[PDB]
Design a protein around this ligand. Structure first.
Ligand SMILES: *CCC(=O)N1CC[C@H](Nc2nccc(Oc3cc(C(=O)Nc4ccc(CN5CCN(CC)CC5)c(C(F)(F)F)c4)ccc3C)n2)C1
Length: 284
């Protein structure tokens, strides 16, 4: 009926072996308890479509995550249940995402955390490209998961305004070869880092979608501000990510040589204590 693979063991399981502990999203996501082991997991319910080429597209995506167990920086999938109407996708529970951390913080996430985040997300994206030939296409804070153990992982969860699309994805310069590649995700990462480092959307004061898309195309990229004490290597990293000319934008292997990443690979940062200190903080 469905198989859950948890901790090297494959359990036969039915949809009723899952006890519902409530919703986590707002497609629908539930916190559930697998009755056989007691594990508390995250489960996404999606409607299946009548288009069997679209069902194939989404199962191909999940196939990738199912085979991404050897990447420490990609959220773990335990398996799926398929009915006529629905696909249930079961994952390790991560406590929250960087989008919800920002709203709880009401302000910036510190650089030492974003440094660790950056190492994890770049390595996850690189892994997806190198091992599975796959581009994420939707890098943004709501797809960056954090937990109590200090892990940071890439997922796909499903005035001022959000916009994460690279210029070449908004408006391809070559109509003959219109496909954006991995550098579009590099840009999205840059935008995500600026948003999380500042606590504010980088593109500000926008009336319409057409205005916002227009801003990305003609404005200078919004870099980290220079008055907030950000390290030179962090500013350089973000600026390299937010190169408008995609032909000049670094690929992942180049980003993995950047000083910012090298520094945060080996620096001890207690993300777990910070995360907990954040969740337990009683000053408003
Ligand atoms: C902001 C989020 C939030 O509020 N919360 C609250 C708590 C919740 N925790 C949690 N923990 C684990 C999982 C989860 O949500 C889910 C996520 C997935 C999931 O990540 N699915 C996938 C699917 C596909 C991919 C890879 N694709 C490659 C192709 N491209 C397009 C071409 C798309 C991506 C991935 C990836 F990237 F590899 F990781 C992930 C599934 C189910 C659930 C429940 N929430 C977070």
């Amino acid at each position: 009926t469905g198989y859950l693979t948890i901790g090297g063991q494959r359990y036969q399981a039915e949809i009723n072996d899952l006890e519902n502990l409530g919703e986590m999203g707002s497609g629908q996501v539930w916190k559930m308890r697998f009755r056989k082991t007691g594990h508390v997991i995250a489960v996404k319910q999606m409607r299946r479509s009548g288009n069997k080429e679209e069902n194939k597209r989404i199962l191909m995506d999940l196939d990738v995550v199912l085979k991404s167990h050897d990447c420490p920086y990609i959220v773990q999938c335990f398996g799926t249940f398929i009915t006529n109407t629905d696909v249930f996708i079961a994952m390790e529970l991560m406590g929250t995402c960087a989008e919800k951390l920002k709203k709880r913080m009401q302000g910036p996430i510190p650089e030492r955390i974003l440094g660790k985040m950056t190492v994890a997300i770049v390595k996850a994206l690189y892994y997806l490209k190198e091992k599975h030939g796959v581009i994420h296409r939707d890098v943004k804070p709501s797809n960056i998961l954090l937990d109590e153990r200090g892990q940071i992982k890439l997922c796909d969860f499903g005035a001022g305004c959000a916009a994460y699309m690279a210029p070449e994805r908004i408006d391809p310069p070559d109509p003959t070869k219109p496909d954006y590649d991995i550098r579009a995700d590099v840009w999205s990462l840059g935008i995500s880092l600026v948003e999380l480092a500042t606590g504010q959307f980088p593109y500000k004061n926008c009336k319409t979608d057409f205005e916002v898309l227009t801003k990305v195309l003609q404005e200078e990229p919004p870099l980290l501000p220079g008055h907030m004490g950000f390290s030179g290597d962090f500013q350089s990293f973000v600026k390299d990510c937010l190169t408008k000319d995609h032909r000049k934008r670094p690929k992942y292997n180049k980003l993995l040589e950047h000083s910012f990443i090298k520094r945060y690979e080996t620096l001890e940062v207690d993300v777990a204590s910070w995360f907990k200190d954040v969740m337990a903080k009683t000053e408003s």
